[PDB]
């Protein structure tokens, strides 16, 4: 049972780099390009870890995380439905990837329900440190 990992990121360069780093660490990942795609993936698969970009179009990672936490609390996606998202007790580890701006403090990540964060640019050592704590 290899751990299942979801990468949520809108920047294609960032995806190619993170994919190769994770491969060297022995992991493959599913890819979502915005919060709506993340929710679609999460609704249909059971992940062991989600790496969640903060700033994305359509639905950002902070709102997506709140909606996933609401789902975990209530058992349904009604918060997401009310927020306009189209949708057809085991707390997901969600790690923010932040971009060094006022709009992306670690405290803000935490206030939207993220468990931890990695400061971009992602490096092998930053990923390693994260995986060794959150993947068993």
């Amino acid at each position: 049972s290899k751990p299942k990992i979801l990468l949520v990121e809108d920047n294609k360069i960032n995806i190619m780099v993170a994919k190769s780093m994770m491969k060297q660490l022995g992991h493959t990942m599913d890819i979502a390009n915005n919060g709506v795609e993340a929710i679609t993936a999460i609704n249909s698969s059971s992940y062991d870890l989600v790496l969640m970009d903060v700033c994305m179009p359509v639905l950002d990672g902070l709102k997506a995380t709140r909606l996933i936490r609401s789902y975990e609390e209530t058992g349904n996606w009604n918060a997401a439905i009310e927020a306009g998202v189209d949708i057809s007790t085991n707390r997901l580890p969600i790690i923010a990837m932040t971009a060094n701006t006022l709009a992306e403090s670690s405290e803000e990540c935490y206030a939207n329900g993220m468990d931890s964060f990695i400061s971009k640019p992602v490096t092998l050592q930053k990923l390693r440190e994260c995986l060794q704590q959150y993947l068993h």
Binding site: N11, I13, N14, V17, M21, V122, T123
Partner: protein, 152 residues
């Protein structure tokens, strides 16, 4: 045609780019990922960078030429270029984009024009230097030589 001197020249050239601030240590992360399991990885990532960034710079150029400048159309382009540059270690492009975002925030159109020109100058510089890096590597490899792997 001395391969030992070619390889030393390539090391010195690479070191110069770091000293000059054109590349930062994130570029080394990319070089570390390139191995027998991933042989052209750096060039592949950098080529994607150029493809995407060429398109962004043309889009930004159109957006700043419009009679009424929609800054909500401009900023996402500067943001994307900042992120991409950061992730390949194009430090001077990244820093020019950080300054650009400041003047986008303040809605200052004249400053933004100047910032766009600067980003272009830095982008064309790093493009020239990285295209040349790959040219030097390919020369050595096609001559039966080798680039030692970055084991950092």
């Amino acid at each position: 045609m001395d391969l030992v001197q070619k390889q030393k020249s390539l090391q010195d050239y690479t070191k110069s780019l770091f000293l000059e601030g054109i590349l930062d240590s994130q570029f080394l992360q990319l070089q570390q990922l390139q191995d027998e399991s991933n042989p052209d990885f750096v060039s592949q990532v950098v080529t994607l960078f150029f493809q995407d960034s060429d398109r962004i710079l043309n889009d930004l150029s159109l957006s700043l030429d419009q009679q009424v400048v929609d800054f909500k159309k401009v900023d996402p382009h500067v943001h994307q270029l900042k992120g991409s540059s950061s992730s390949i270690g194009a430090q001077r492009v990244k820093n020019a984009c950080v300054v650009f975002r400041s003047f986008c925030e303040q809605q200052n159109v004249e400053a933004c024009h100047r910032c766009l020109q600067q980003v272009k100058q830095e982008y064309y510089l790093v493009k020239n230097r990285l295209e040349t890096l790959f040219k030097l590597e390919q020369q050595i490899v096609a001559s039966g030589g080798m680039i030692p792997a970055v084991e950092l």
